[PDB]
Every structure is written in structure tokens, then in C-alpha cells.
Paper text:
Within this complex, UvrA acts as the initial damage sensor but hands off the lesion-containing DNA to UvrB and dissociates, leaving UvrB bound to the lesion in a preincision complex, the precise nature of which is not known. Both UvrA and UvrB expend ATP to form the preincision complex, which is believed to require threading of a β-hairpin element on UvrB through the DNA duplex. UvrB presents the lesion-containing strand to UvrC, which catalyzes hydrolysis of the 5th phosphodiester bond 3′ to the lesion and then the 8th phosphodiester bond 5′ to the lesion. UvrB is classified as a member of SF2 helicases on the basis of conserved helicase motifs (I-VI) (Supplementary ).
We therefore introduced a mutant Cys residue into the hydrophobic pocket and disulfide-crosslinked the resulting UvrB(T251C) protein to a single-stranded DNA substrate containing a thiol-tethered nucleobase, a cytosine. The complimentary strand is designed to contain two pyrimidine-pyrimidine mismatches on the immediate 5′ side of the modified cytosine; these were introduced to destabilize the duplex in the region expected to form a bubble, thereby facilitating maintenance of the helix-penetrated state for the β-hairpin. We determined crystal structures of UvrB disulfide-crosslinked to a 20-mer duplex substrate, in both the presence and absence of ATP, at 2.6 Å and 2.8 Å resolution, respectively. As expected on the basis of the synthetic crystallography approach used to trap these structures, the 13th nucleobase on the inner strand, a cytosine, is extruded from the duplex and inserted into the hydrophobic pocket between domains 1a and 1b. As predicted, in our structures the β-hairpin loop was found to be fully inserted between the two DNA strands, clamping the inner strand between the β-hairpin and domain 1b (Figures 3a–3(c)). Though insertion of the β-hairpin loop requires disruption of only one or two base-pairs at the insertion site, our structures reveal disruption of base-pairing throughout the entire 6 bp duplex region comprising the crosslinked cytosine. In our structures of a lesion-mimetic recognition complex, the duplex runs along the entire long axis of UvrB, contacting every domain except for domain 2 (Figures 3a–3(c)). The outer strand also makes contacts to UvrB, but these comprise almost exclusively van der Waals interactions. If so, the observed contacts between the helicase motifs engaged in DNA binding and the inner strand phosphates suggest that our structures obtained in both the presence and absence of ATP (hydrolyzed to ADP and Pi in crystallo) represent “open” states.
Numbering used by the authors: 3 to 593
DNA sequence: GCTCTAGATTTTCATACGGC
DNA sequence: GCCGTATGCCAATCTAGAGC
């Protein structure tokens, strides 16, 4: 395939040079590069240009699913002729199996699956074999266990007009790859028959079923079919039907796997019983033998993922197969918000290991359950072909592995990194209150950041006493109601929002002209250099953007952020001067 | 170095049950 | 043994500080 970028506009401002640097580094074979793109500079359009120029299948990794969704929307509009795909957790809810020693409690695994997300997951994986012009937006789900891509590929049922194959032989192979017959409710992951037509709804597709028409053992035709109404659509010459699960469990391997699980259990029970952990072994035997009977009286068992490694016959310690393995060897990775996303990726292994080791220590699971896991960060490193880290505040790992940075600060809209004032703590709430009132005069909103949920709630109350319209925003408030609070800020219900750590990455509020950082000098994660610069960027979407940092000293963290903001402004002033640009505030749609 | 602390996101091969 | 349906808010992750 071949990527076709589609937009009205050309690259502008800093975008051209940025695109050129990243493309040349990629072509020279450089492994790690870093796009130091300041906020609201059109970072998704820049990276799309790179993808379009180098024409490699690409994985965009995001640290959260809201941002994941936006990237996926924007990229769908930029590449409407290409396979833009989505790959995140497909669980409506999920609690893992866990044991909590401090409160001596076992917690059952509970789950519930979202059908749309599973459909997208299958569209994503199948796309990577059907064609080369694929971009997948993904969460850290990308580093979790799937079945091997080789097995996933060889189980495909490939069909072409002219083929000779027994009607029932197709059907019986479809069942092998996890499809169900269903003449009543014809939906994805199911098939049916209507005389000569064998109608197949692939696992990757919402509304568009295949219709394979037979004459004896021949295939006279194949047809994509709109299943909203029932009408027929275009007539293909071939089609590929991929498995309706990323996990194969065939009996041929399962028989030996059972005796391997059987013999790991013996050894572990002897181990536990020897150490006077008699309760633990009784636990381990009761679950393992029950699961093993289910494994003999059925294909499945409960918690089957715990026996991943045995059921695959792969050795102890094995690195799992993942989405990354489904990509070609010359693929490309974009890491969105790398300073937050990479630490998250690092820690997926740690938390999973922690949780599973206590299950194993208390005899809920065998030691081989540790091999059912995500990648370690080191295993992620070894699977990188080439990678681009995007962030306004790139972290240590990105800088240390990249040959300097591609800097992109000039915004196509000419908006400046705001000015910053530093004021004393003496009489700070009154100074702020008056400064908010001037903003309410100009119909401009304000963000205030404190250190705690308690302080954010107390200031909201106190600002209500002063007659200011205001809400607090922190993580006690569920996602749905946060969307609504932010919506209601823009419409004008509130002139102020008080927060802690939800007022940085991916918050475009054009109406905000003031950002108030309280306790600006209290050293810690909330007032580190990066979180400081990220908070400052909330005021860079409005032409009268301003920052007040209340503090009595100026920390090292404060002085780097002040200096790097000033420098960025000065460069943006000069570009604006050269081109006669007067900064204009962002007109963005509500909802 | 170990053990707290604050406010943050993400992830994880559904399953027990009653009525057939 | 098969199948349709009601069901949960239950962990350990991160950074970068503070006491020892
Ligand atoms: Cl979506
Ligand atoms: Mg499934
Ligand atoms: Mg491997
Ligand atoms: Mg590679």
C-alpha cells in the first residue's frame, strides 16, 4: 500500500523543518528520535507527514484512552484511504484475580467485554496482514499477550472465485477458528447458510458481511453485503477470513501441556507442603485439579490465561507474543506524551508481577503463571525498529537515547507561550481573587492549581464566599461528570476551575487566559520542571495568556520553566514579527 | 536504600447460576 | 451438559518528594 495524506492546509510555522529532520533521521536508520513539540503546534499533522513520507506501518502508543480516541479520529480524517485502526483494552470493567495479604482477602476475577472494541482489535491485527498502509492507535494493551502472529496467519481461511472446496468443509474450518453458526442473530463472529450462499460475518466487521455463493463445490461469486437493511454491495474476487480469537488452543498440543501442568503442580505441592504451607497447597491443588478436569471435559477452563505458557509448549521464562510482533520488521512507533507514557509502559510489568507473585506465594496459582504477563521495558526496547517520542516535556530516557531533539514551537495560529509573574505568598488569595475579577470582566476563564484534593475543595468554598463562580476538578469526580464540568466552564457556568493534576496534558480550553499555580515552590512531582511547563501550556491557547506562580523562593524547577517559556515566547514573537502575524485565540467547537 | 506520602492513567485469553 | 443472562466499582502500577 501507500499512505495518502489528506488535509486542506500545507505544513506551516515550524512544521516543515520538523518534518524534514524526523524523515531524514528515519531514512538514515536512526533508532530513537524526539519531537520536542510545544503544545498546540499541530503535532498530529507533523507526525502524519512523516508517516506519509516514509510509508512504514506505524503504531501510535498513547498513555490514555480519551487521547487515543482523538488521535484515532484525526488520523481517520487525515488518512481516509488507508487502514487507520484502534487497539485498546476491550473490557467494560475488569478486576483481576488478586490476594491482599494485609487484609487476608481473595478477590475473584470479574470481567465484562465491550463488543465494539473487540471488533476494532480484530480489524487492527487482520489489517497488518492484508496490507502495508496501516496505522494503529493503541494503549499499552499493545505490550500484552496475544497468540503468535505465525499461528494467527496460518489458521486463515483464504477464499477466491474459482476455488474448489466442500460447503461443509468451509463451515467446519470456520468453527475451528472460533466462529459460531447463527441463523437467528446474524452478527460479527458468526455465519449462516441460505441454500447456496454461505454468508460469513468477519470478526473485524460491524455491518459488512461476506456472501460466498456456491455452485457444487465451486465459488461463482463473493460479495460484501450491507447488513443494516440487507441489500448487497460490491463484488470482490477474493476475501480473507481471519480467526475470531487472538488465541488458539488446539488439542494436539494440549495433551502434553496437561501432563506438564500436572508435573509442575506435583513439584510445587511438595515444595509448599515441605515448608509447612499446608493451606496454600490445599488451595493450589483444589483450583489446579478443577481447572485441569475442565480442560479435559471441555476445551476451556476458568482463568485459562494462567496456563498460557504451558498450553503453548514454550519454555519457562519466555517472552510473550504481542501486537508489536504482528507488525513487519521495518515498522515505526510513535510514543505520544512519552514523558508519561514510557513510565506507564515500564510499570505494567511491575504491577502485574507483584500481583501474581503473591498469588503464587499463597498457593492460588503455579509459578508458571508469572510467564503470563506483559513485556518488561527491556523486551519493549529490543522490539523497537525505529521510534519517535513526542512531548512538550520529554523525559530522561527520550533525551538520553535521541541525538538531540527536533524542536517545534512555532504555532500556525501565532499564539505565544504566555508571560509568567512570580508573586509572594503574603496576601496571595486576595491578589488572585482580584486578578480573577479582571478576567471575569474580559469574559476569560481561569485555572488554579493546588497540591491536594482538600486544598482544592477548601479554595473552591472560599472563592464561593468571595462571590466567584467556580468548581473543583479532581479524580473523585467520574469521567462523565468531568467532561460536563469542563464543558460547563467553556459555556460560562464557571469562571474558575481549581485542580491538582488533571489540568495539563490534553486540555484545550481557548477561553482560559490565566493560570494560577499555588504553592509553586513546594518541590515534588506536582512542581517538577515538566509538570510546571505542562501547566503553563494551558495558558498558551489564548492571546492574553498569563501565568502567576505564587511562591517566596524560586526553585531550580521554577527557573528552568520560566527560562524555557520566555525563550519560546521570544522565538514566537520574532516569527510573528517577520510575517506580520497578530496572535488570534483558538475558535474550537464545544462538544 | 527502605517506608512512607500525594493524586494520576493504563492493563488483564468472563463466569456463576437457574432453567431446562 | 448446554445456553442465555445478570453480574463488579474489589490491585498494583507512576514520580519525586519526606523521614529515617
Ligand atoms: Cl472509539
Ligand atoms: Mg473473544
Ligand atoms: Mg518472542
Ligand atoms: Mg524490529
Amino acid at each position: 500500500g501507500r499512505f495518502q495524506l489528506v488535509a486542506p492546509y500545507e505544513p506551516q510555522g515550524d512544521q516543515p523543518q520538523a518534518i524534514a529532520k524526523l524523515v531524514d533521521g528515519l531514512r538514515r536508520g536512526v533508532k530513537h528520535q524526539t519531537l520536542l513539540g510545544a503544545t498546540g503546534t499541530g503535532k498530529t499533522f507533523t507526525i502524519s507527514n512523516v508517516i506519509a513520507q516514509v510509508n512504514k506501518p506505524t503504531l501510535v502508543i498513547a498513555h490514555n484512552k480519551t487521547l487515543a480516541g482523538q488521535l484515532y479520529s484525526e488520523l481517520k480524517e487525515f488518512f481516509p484511504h488507508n487502514a487507520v485502526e484502534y487497539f485498546v483494552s476491550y473490557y467494560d470493567y475488569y478486576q483481576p484475580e488478586a490476594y491482599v495479604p494485609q487484609t487476608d482477602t481473595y478477590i475473584e476475577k470479574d470481567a465484562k467485554i465491550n463488543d465494539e472494541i473487540d471488533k476494532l482489535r480484530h480489524s487492527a491485527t487482520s489489517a497488518l496482514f492484508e496490507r502495508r498502509d496501516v496505522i494503529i492507535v493503541a494503549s499499552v494493551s499493545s505490550i500484552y499477550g496475544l497468540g503468535s502472529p505465525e499461528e494467527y496467519r496460518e489458521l486463515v481461511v483464504s477464499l477466491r472465485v474459482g476455488m474448489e472446496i466442500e460447503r461443509n468443509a468451509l463451515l467446519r474450518r470456520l468453527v475451528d477458528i472460533q466462529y459460531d453458526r447463527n441463523d437467528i442473530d446474524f452478527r460479527r463472529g458468526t455465519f449462516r447458510v441460505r441454500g447456496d450462499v454461505v454468508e460469513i460475518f468477519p470478526a473485524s466487521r460491524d455491518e459488512h458481511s461476506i456472501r460466498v455463493e456456491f455452485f457444487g463445490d465451486e465459488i461463482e461469486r463473493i460479495r460484501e453485503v450491507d447488513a443494516l437493511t440487507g441489500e448487497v454491495l460490491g463484488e470482490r474476487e477474493h476475501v480473507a477470513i481471519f480467526p475470531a480469537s487472538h488465541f488458539v488452543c488446539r488439542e494436539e498440543k494440549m495433551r502434553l501441556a496437561i501432563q506438564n501442568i500436572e508435573q509442575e503442580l506435583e513439584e510445587r505441592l511438595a515444595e509448599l507442603r515441605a515448608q509447612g504451607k499446608l493451606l496454600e497447597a490445599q488451595r493450589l491443588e483444589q483450583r489446579t485439579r478443577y481447572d485441569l478436569e475442565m480442560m479435559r471435559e471441555m476445551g476451556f477452563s476458568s482463568g485459562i490465561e494462567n496456563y498460557s505458557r504451558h498450553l503453548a509448549l514454550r519454555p519457562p521464562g519466555s517472552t510473550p507474543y504481542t501486537l508489536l510482533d504482528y507488525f513487519p520488521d521495518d515498522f515505526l512507533i510513535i510514543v505520544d506524551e512519552s514523558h508519561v507514557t514510557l513510565p506507564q509502559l515500564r510499570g505494567m510489568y511491575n504491577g502485574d508481577r507483584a500481583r501474581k507473585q503473591v498469588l503464587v506465594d499463597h498457593g492460588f496459582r503455579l509459578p508458571s503463571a508469572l510467564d503470563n504477563r506483559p513485556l518488561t521495558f527491556e523486551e519493549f526496547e529490543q522490539k523497537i525498529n525505529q521510534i519517535i517520542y513526542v512531548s512538550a516535556t520529554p523525559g530522561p530516557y527520550e533525551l538520553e537515547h535521541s541525538p538531540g531533539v527536533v524542536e517545534q514551537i512555532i504555532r500556525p495560529t501565532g499564539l505565544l507561550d504566555p508571560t509568567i509573574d512570580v508573586r509572594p505568598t503574603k496576601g496571595q488569595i486576595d491578589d488572585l481573587i482580584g486578578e480573577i475579577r479582571e478576567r471575569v470582566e474580559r469574559n476569560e476563564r481561569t485555572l488554579v492549581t493546588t497540591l491536594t484534593k482538600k486544598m482544592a475543595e477548601d479554595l473552591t468554598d472560599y472563592l464561593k464566599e468571595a462571590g466567584i463562580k467556580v468548581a473543583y476538578l479532581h479524580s473523585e469526580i467520574k469521567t462523565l461528570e468531568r467532561i460536563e464540568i469542563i464543558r460547563d466552564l467553556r459555556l460560562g457556568k464557571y469562571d474558575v476551575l481549581v485542580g491538582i493534576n488533571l489540568l495539563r496534558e490534553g486540555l484545550d480550553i481557548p477561553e482560559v487566559s490565566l493560570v494560577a499555580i499555588l504553592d509553586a515552590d513546594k518541590e515534588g512531582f506536582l512542581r517538577s520542571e515538566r509538570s510546571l511547563i505542562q501547566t503553563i501550556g494551558r495558558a498558551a491557547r489564548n492571546a492574553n495568556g498569563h501565568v502567576i506562580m505564587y511562591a517566596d523562593t524560586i526553585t531550580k524547577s521554577m527557573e528552568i520553566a520560566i527560562q524555557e517559556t520566555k525563550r519560546r515566547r521570544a522565538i514566537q514573537e520574532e516569527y510573528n514579527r517577520k510575517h506580520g502575524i497578530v496572535p488570534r485565540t483558538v475558535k474550537k467547537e464545544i462538544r
